[PDB]
Amino acid sequence: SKNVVIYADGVYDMLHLGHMKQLEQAKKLFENTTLIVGVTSDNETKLFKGQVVQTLEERTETLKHIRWVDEIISPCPWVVTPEFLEKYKIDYVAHDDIYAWLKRAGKFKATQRTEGVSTTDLIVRILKNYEDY
Amino acid sequence: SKNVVIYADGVYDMLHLGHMKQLEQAKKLFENTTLIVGVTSDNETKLFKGQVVQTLEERTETLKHIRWVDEIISPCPWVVTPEFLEKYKIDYVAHDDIYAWLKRAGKFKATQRTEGVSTTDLIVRILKNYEDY
Numbered sequence: 001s002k003n004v005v006i007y008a009d010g011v012y013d014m015l016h017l018g019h020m021k022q023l024e025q026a027k028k029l030f031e032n033t034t035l036i037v038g039v040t041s042d043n044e045t046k047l048f049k050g051q052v053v054q055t056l057e058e059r060t061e062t063l064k065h066i067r068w069v070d071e072i073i074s075p076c077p078w079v080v081t082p083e084f085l086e087k088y089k090i091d092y093v094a095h096d097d098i099y100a101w102l103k104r105a106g107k108f109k110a111t112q113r114t115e116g117v118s119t120t121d122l123i124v125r126i127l128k129n130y131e132d133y
Numbered sequence: 134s135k136n137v138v139i140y141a142d143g144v145y146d147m148l149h150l151g152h153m154k155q156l157e158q159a160k161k162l163f164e165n166t167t168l169i170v171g172v173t174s175d176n177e178t179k180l181f182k183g184q185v186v187q188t189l190e191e192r193t194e195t196l197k198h199i200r201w202v203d204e205i206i207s208p209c210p211w212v213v214t215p216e217f218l219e220k221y222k223i224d225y226v227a228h229d230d231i232y233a234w235l236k237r238a239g240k241f242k243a244t245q246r247t248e249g250v251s252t253t254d255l256i257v258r259i260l261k262n263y264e265d266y
Contacts, residue, residue, distance in 0.1 A: 014255055017191070020198040053255050058150070065153040067200035122147055122186050123256055 004030040007085070008094040008111070009038030009076050011045050012059045013052045014119035020066060025111045026094035027068035036088060037069050038076025048078060137163040140218070141227040141244070142171030142209050144178050145192045146185045147252035153199060158244045159227035160201035169221060170202050171209025181211060 008026040012019055027035040039060050045052050054062075060074040077084060080093060085107065092109045093102055102108040141159040145152055160168040172193050178185050187195075193207040210217060213226060218240065225242045226235055235241040 014252070017195050017198075020195065024198065053258050062150050062153065065150075065157065065200060066198055067202075068198070069200075119147070119252060119255070122252070125186050 001031045003032045003034060005034045005036065005089055005091045006094050006109070007036045007038065007088065007090040007092070009040065009080070011040050011049070011052060012063055013054050015059070015062045016119045017117040018114040021114050022096070022111050023066055023068040029092065029094060029109050034070045035068055036071040036073060036090065037063060039063060039072060039074040040078060041075035044078040134164045136165045136167060138167045138169065138222055138224045139163075139227050139242070140169045140171065140221065140223040140225070142173065142213070144173050144182070144185060145196055146187050148192070148195045149252045150250040151247040154247050155229070155244050156199055156201040162225065162227060162242050167203045168201055169204040169206060169223065170196060172196060172205060172207040173211060174208035177211040
């Protein structure tokens with residue numbers, strides 16, 4: 001079948017198994033895809049969403065090692081627009097109502113977040129070795 | 134050129150950019166390779182080396198997402214033997230003197246560890262936002 005261009009975006013701070021599973025899901029939405037991943041800017045993530053420990057360049061450099069990632073847009077726009085999809089020839093956005101327009105266009109494909117597999121979850125596990133009393 | 138089988142092993146706890154760079158280096162030791170990665174057992178790592186937060190299965194599942202990894206042996210032997218190299222048809226071991234035999238055989242290829250890019254380094258960076266006073 002013909003190639004389908006998928007776009008996913010996010011912060012990808014402290015990249016962990018949950019990110020990797022969500023990227024794998026986006027990559028496998030169709031038989032033959034190109035997965036483009038957008039990595040949000042330091043300034044916009046911190047201003048609009050919350051704290052980020054790794055820089056844009058760090059988050060992007062780690063992402064390049066993930067086998068599902070075919071292209072990276074770094075930094076990506078904070079808000080996806082139809083003009084953006086046209087510019088990068090994106091067929092679908094893989095996403096976990098400001099997104100109504102994507103759904104009306106047939107370009108919204110749901111992906112899932114995995115709970116309990118994050119990097120901070122691992123640190124909590126480390127800390128549990130130290131009893132309160 | 135003909136395909137070269139490379140073996141690298143380690144713990145791969147809290148997989149981070151330094152692991153990924155070392156795996157990339159092993160994968161690119163030759164033009165055409167198969168990179169086999171051995172993931173050490175929970176019991177042997179803890180007994181012989183030190184603490185590990187993720188299980189064998191967790192460490193292995195994260196590794197499968199790394200684009201340089203062609204095959205995983207999970208768990209791998211704690212000590213590499215010549216019989217192991219023969220069994221898996223391994224041409225070179227990518228490694229960062231119990232290893233003298235590998236060097237005498239021409240099967241030792243050095244790789245480098247990157248400093249300051251680990252997962253715990255990221256947590257230290259988080260903690261620095263909280264001043265002592």
